[PDB]
Design a protein around this ligand. Structure first.
Ligand SMILES: Nc1cccc(-c2nc3ccccc3c(=O)[nH]2)c1
Ligand SMILES: [Zn+2]
Lengths: 47, 161
C-alpha cells in the first residue's frame, strides 16, 4: 500500500462532476477500519 | 475469533443499517455495467461481525489518530464491497485488500454510496459478474457488502471527476 499524504490519515475523493455522487474515501492502514456489519442481499430488477 | 450474530429485521439496528444501504443507492455513469441495473435491494440478512482482537486493533489505531488530530478520530460508517469479504471478516483489513490501481493510490477504498461498493463485490469493474451465471447484473445470486467503521482522521481532500 501507499502512504497517506504527509500530515494526513486518509484521502477523501470529493465528486466534482456528478452532482448526485457521494464521497469515497481511502485509508492506507488496515487498522483504520472495522467490518461491523455483513449485509447479504440481492439487487432488484426495476419494475 | 470471528462470530456472526444475525440481527432480527425487527431490531432498530437492522432497520437503521438497511435504511443506509437503501437510501444511498444512486445511478452510475456506466449505466449499470459494473454493478447491475437496480434502484434498490432485497436485503436477505444483516449480521454483526464480532471479533475482539480485530476490534482492539481498530480502537488502538483510532486513539493514535485521535491524539494526532485534536481528539477527533473523524469516524464514519462506510460501505465496502470486495471479493475478499470472507478474509476481511476473519483476519481484518490489510494490504491484500487494497485497490492497487485506485484513483487515489494503493489503499483500501470505502464509499458513502452503497451502490458504489456494489460495483466491487465481484471484483474491479464487477469482474466477470456472479460465479454461477457470469452476470454483473445477476438478480438471483446473493451478494455481500460490509458496512464498516472507518477512522479518517485528518483527511486529504481531492476534488475529482
Ligand atoms: N480492487 C478492489 C478490491 C476490493 C475492493 C475494491 C473496492 N474499491 C472501491 C472503490 C471506490 C469505492 C468503494 C470501493 C470498494 O468498496 N471496494 C477494489
Ligand atoms: Zn448469478
Amino acid at each position: 500500500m501507499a502512504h497517506s499524504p504527509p500530515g494526513h490519515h486518509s484521502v477523501t475523493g470529493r465528486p466534482s462532476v456528478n452532482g448526485l455522487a457521494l464521497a469515497e474515501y481511502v485509508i492506507y492502514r488496515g487498522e483504520q477500519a472495522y467490518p461491523e456489519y455483513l449485509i447479504t442481499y440481492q439487487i432488484m430488477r426495476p419494475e | 475469533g470471528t462470530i456472526l450474530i444475525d440481527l432480527s429485521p425487527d431490531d432498530k439496528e437492522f432497520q437503521s443499517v438497511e435504511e443506509e444501504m437503501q437510501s444511498t443507492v444512486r445511478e452510475h455513469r456506466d449505466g449499470g455495467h459494473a454493478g447491475g441495473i437496480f434502484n434498490r435491494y432485497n436485503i436477505l440478512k444483516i449480521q454483526k461481525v464480532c471479533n475482539k482482537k480485530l476490534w482492539e486493533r481498530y480502537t488502538h489505531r483510532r486513539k493514535e489518530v485521535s491524539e494526532e488530530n485534536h481528539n477527533h478520530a473523524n469516524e464514519r460508517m462506510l460501505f465496502h464491497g470486495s471479493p475478499f469479504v470472507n478474509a476481511i471478516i476473519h483476519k481484518g483489513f490489510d494490504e491484500r485488500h487494497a485497490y492497487i490501481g485506485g484513483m487515489f493510490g494503493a489503499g483500501i477504498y470505502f464509499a458513502e454510496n452503497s451502490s458504489k461498493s456494489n460495483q466491487y463485490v465481484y471484483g474491479i469493474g464487477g469482474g466477470t459478474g456472479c460465479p454461477v451465471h457470469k452476470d454483473r447484473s445477476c438478480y438471483i445470486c446473493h451478494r455481500q457488502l460490509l458496512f464498516c467503521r472507518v477512522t479518517l482522521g485528518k483527511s486529504f481532500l481531492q476534488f475529482s471527476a
